[PDB]
């Protein structure tokens, strides 16, 4: 909605709206900067869980760092409390369940504080009195701290009253016991948020390295220091050019995997495109399009296409 930047005046009685509006503007400003370089500046930084109570059909989060599409960053390690335990008793008939972190919508018409009064909708804010340290001196004072009213909900539930972000998926094992699905990938703000994607990404890089080292040994020497390239090496050069150009770029993205997946996608798609020139078994529509909400429909099929393209590249 509207953001009313406050004007600070000499005789003025200080109002909560002045501080609320200033804080809202700063959130919008930081979000507008993020949008200059990225199409989707929201998603999971960290989504860690305790699996110990899964045989008792209970799921607890240990660490949640998630940015919502409205620019609100939630951080249980720094500013927020962990959401209450997720009870899986209602999904005893299911084999699969998608867990979402839910943040109630901010109501521009007020009533955002969950004060225990009745409401037709969930309230975004909770107030907790915390003895907060005064940083210049040595005193502490009890201050009303803003706590986001976060809950772990399920994707099949009615969630329009909340901003939601996929945070895990649970699947039943051979015994029917709930366990976190390793194939799950949430919308990403960092690559590190998904350890399985990281394992798959490291596998691709290793496969690329092995393939390019094998292809680099296959060039005929023009002289002692220069490579010989003829009409017969049309496939050999462009393959080597594609692998040699991409490998140091992909290596630096993977060595510090704390950036947005749009950066990685761009380079992975560029490499896939370059390799498709020598394949007859694919369309060029083969490169999966980038969809932020479901990275499972972009990175696993793109890594699958790349691994197949690396193997078949020898001709």
């Amino acid at each position: 909605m509207k953001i009313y930047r406050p004007l600070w005046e000499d005789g003025a009685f200080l109002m909560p709206q002045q501080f609320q509006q200033q804080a809202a503007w700063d959130v919008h400003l930081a979000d507008s900067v993020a949008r200059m370089g990225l199409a989707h500046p929201w998603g999971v930084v960290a989504a860690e869980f305790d699996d110990s109570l899964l045989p008792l059909s209970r799921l607890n989060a240990t660490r949640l760092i998630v940015r919502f599409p409205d620019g609100t960053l939630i951080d249980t390690e720094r500013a927020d409390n962990l959401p209450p335990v997720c009870d899986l008793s209602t999904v005893s008939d299911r084999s699969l369940v998608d867990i979402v972190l839910a943040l109630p919508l901010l109501n521009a018409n007020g009533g955002n504080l969950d004060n225990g009064s009745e409401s037709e909708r969930p309230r975004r804010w909770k107030s907790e009195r915390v003895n907060v340290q005064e940083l210049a001196g040595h005193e502490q004072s009890e201050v009303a701290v803003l706590r986001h009213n976060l809950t772990l909900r399920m994707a099949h539930q009615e969630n329009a009253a909340w901003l939601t972000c996929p945070v895990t998926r649970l699947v039943r094992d051979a015994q029917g016991q709930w366990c976190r699905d390793p194939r799950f990938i949430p919308p990403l703000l960092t690559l590190s948020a998904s350890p399985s994607l990281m394992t798959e990404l490291l596998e691709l890089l290793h496969h690329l390295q092995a393939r390019r080292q094998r292809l680099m040994s296959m060039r005929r020497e023009n002289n002692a220091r220069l490579a010989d390239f003829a009409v017969a090496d049309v496939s050999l050069f462009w393959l080597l050019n594609a692998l040699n150009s991409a490998e140091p770029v992909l290596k630096e993205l993977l060595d510090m995997p704390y950036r947005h997946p749009e950066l990685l996608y761009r380079e992975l798609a560029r490499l896939a495109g370059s390799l498709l020139t020598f394949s007859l078994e694919h369309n060029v529509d083969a490169v999966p399009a980038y969809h932020h909400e479901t990275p499972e429909n972009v990175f696993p099929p793109l890594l699958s296409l790349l691994n197949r393209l690396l193997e078949a590249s020898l001709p």
């Epitope: 409205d70 521009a108 037709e120 909708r121 009615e158």
Partner: nanobody, 119 residues
Framework: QVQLVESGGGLVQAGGTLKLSCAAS????????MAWYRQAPGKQRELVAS???????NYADSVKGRFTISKDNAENTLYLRMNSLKPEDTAVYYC?????????????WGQGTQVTVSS
Amino acid sequence: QVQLVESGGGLVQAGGTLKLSCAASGSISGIVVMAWYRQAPGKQRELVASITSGGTTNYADSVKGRFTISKDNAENTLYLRMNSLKPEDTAVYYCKAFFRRDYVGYDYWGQGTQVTVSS
């Protein structure tokens, strides 16, 4: 924006029945939940009943088992069927829509309709 117009209000005897209507127009696709609120003379506004866009109903303890909230999506009309009306049900009844646009929530209200239960 969402426009709400209430109708069906009036005078009824104790133990009687009334059906309130609320016609919704405008950006209807954004409505998350619709509700009925009431303001009795000299009392604060109170939530009576609510219905999500998906049809999940909820009632305040004071009206539970007596009132029925329903929605006609083909006509974009909210209904409140009120049975076993008591003098404490006398109030101005307001239609409300909790609307969602671009990750933000908004409240829209009707003008209200007078409901009087005589003893």
